[PDB]
């Protein structure tokens, strides 16, 4: 579990991961699915 976006001073996340609009970078369709994705919308 890693924080991104405004929740991380505008920090970006690596590939194979999804950055939740709520500055929350995680995995799984739970955060990768369409509805809470903002950045890095191409994770595994």
Curated annotation (Swiss-Prot):
S-S bonds? 4-19, 13-25, 16-44, 18-32, 37-41
* Function, as annotated: Binds chitin. Has antifungal activity against the fungi F.solani (IC(50)=5 ug/ml), F.verticillioides (IC(50)=30 ug/ml), F.oxysporum (IC(50)=5 ug/ml), B.sorokiniana (IC(50)=5 ug/ml), B.cinerea (IC(50)=20 ug/ml) and N.crassa (IC(50)=10 ug/ml). Inhibits hyphal elongation and causes browning of hyphae in F.oxysporum. Causes destruction and discoloration of spores in B.sorokiniana. Inhibits the development of disease caused by the fungus P.infestans on potato tubers.
Q: What's this protein's name?
A: Antimicrobial peptide 1a
Q: What's the source species' lineage?
A: Eukaryota, Viridiplantae, Streptophyta, Embryophyta, Tracheophyta
Chitin-binding type-1 domain residues are 1-43
- Portion held of the full protein: 35 to 78 of 116
């Amino acid at each position: 579990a890693q924080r991104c976006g405004d929740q991380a001073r505008g920090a970006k996340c690596p590939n194979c991961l999804c950055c939740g609009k709520y500055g929350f970078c995680g995995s799984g369709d739970a955060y990768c699915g369409a509805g809470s994705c903002q950045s890095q919308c191409r994770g595994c």
